[PDB]
Amino acid sequence: MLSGLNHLTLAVSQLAPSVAFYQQLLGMTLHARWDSGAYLSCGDLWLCLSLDPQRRVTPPEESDYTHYAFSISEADFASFAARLEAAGVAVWKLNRSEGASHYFLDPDGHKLELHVGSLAQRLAACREQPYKGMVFF
Amino acid sequence: MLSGLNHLTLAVSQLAPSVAFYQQLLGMTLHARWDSGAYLSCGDLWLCLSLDPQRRVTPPEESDYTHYAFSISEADFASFAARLEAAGVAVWKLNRSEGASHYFLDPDGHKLELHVGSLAQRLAACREQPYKGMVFF
Numbered sequence: 001m002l003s004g005l006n007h008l009t010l011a012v013s014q015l016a017p018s019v020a021f022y023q024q025l026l027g028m029t030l031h032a033r034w035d036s037g038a039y040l041s042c043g044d045l046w047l048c049l050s051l052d053p054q055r056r057v058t059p060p061e062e063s064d065y066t067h068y069a070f071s072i073s074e075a076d077f078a079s080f081a082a083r084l085e086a087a088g089v090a091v092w093k094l095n096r097s098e099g100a101s102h103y104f105l106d107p108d109g110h111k112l113e114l115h116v117g118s119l120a121q122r123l124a125a126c127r128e129q130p131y132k133g134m135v136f137f
Numbered sequence: 138m139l140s141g142l143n144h145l146t147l148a149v150s151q152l153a154p155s156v157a158f159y160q161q162l163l164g165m166t167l168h169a170r171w172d173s174g175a176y177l178s179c180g181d182l183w184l185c186l187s188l189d190p191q192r193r194v195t196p197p198e199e200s201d202y203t204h205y206a207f208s209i210s211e212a213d214f215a216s217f218a219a220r221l222e223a224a225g226v227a228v229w230k231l232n233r234s235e236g237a238s239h240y241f242l243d244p245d246g247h248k249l250e251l252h253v254g255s256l257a258q259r260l261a262a263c264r265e266q267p268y269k270g271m272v273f274f
């Protein structure tokens with residue numbers, strides 16, 4: 001029986017700028033770094049950065065919608081999004097925001113998101129404004 | 138401040154086989170589906186499948202090391218891996234690292250993993266035999 005996410009591993013092209021991004025800019029906790037990777041945490045999330053020469057810096061128009069969203073509180077959302085824009089972080093665009101969300105890219109073009117709200121909250125909101133063809137179980 | 142992972146979204150090329158894989162084969166809970174996506178949960182993981190015409194069915198040799206690991210207990214690991222092998226799920230790597238891991242592909246070539254063990258367990262193993270260049274914080 002699967003019980004949740006154990007870890008998320010991102011391939012990165014250059015280790016030092018990626019550690020800097022996740023630790024200095026996003027505030028994650030750095031536990032360990034070595035010649036080919038790093039271990040960070042963000043609450044319960046175990047994040048591994050893995051140096052991979054096969055990682056390409058990929059423009060958002062030519063990668064698919066696979067993305068990783070991090071939780072932030074309603075009180076902190078706007079000020080955190082503002083700090084990312086002030087730091088020059090690149091954005092990516094989608095037809096429609098998933099509620100209160102900010103979409104941004106990491107140095108290698110991984111698609112990230114800040115989002116306020118849980119699954120239960122999204123289900124309740126979607127009952128009032130459903131996607132086309134939506135069915136609830 | 139970020140508090141954890143909010144959700145993981147995977148781009149899929151065909152919704153029905155992806156729902157069958159995550160719900161029926163992997164045992165995740167299906168909460169809602171619509172014409173272009175689905176919401177599932179796996180413990181405290183919120184997984185979104187999003188139908189994306191940009192998604193290519195990608196061979197493992199053509200994608201990088203980015204991958205997503207799910208938690209499972211040691212007691213359940215072998216029988217779960219046997220289930221995947223009976224269903225014909227492809228393996229993209231052999232484990233050679235701390236602890237039990239099984240590395241398998243989704244129908245679109247997303248790289249998945251079953252892993253037993255926590256970050257703390259990994260850090261303790263690394264303190265005993267640190268990787269090349271390893272520094273702890």
Ligand SMILES: *Sc1ncccc1C(=N)N
Pocket residue numbers: 096099122125126127129130131132
């Ligand atoms: S599912 C949903 N919930 C709340 C607001 C908008 C939407 C939507 N895009 N249908």
Ligand SMILES: [Mn+2]
Pocket residue numbers: 067069098113144146
């Ligand atoms: Mn999202």
Ligand SMILES: [Mn+2]
Pocket residue numbers: 007009204206250
């Ligand atoms: Mn892994």
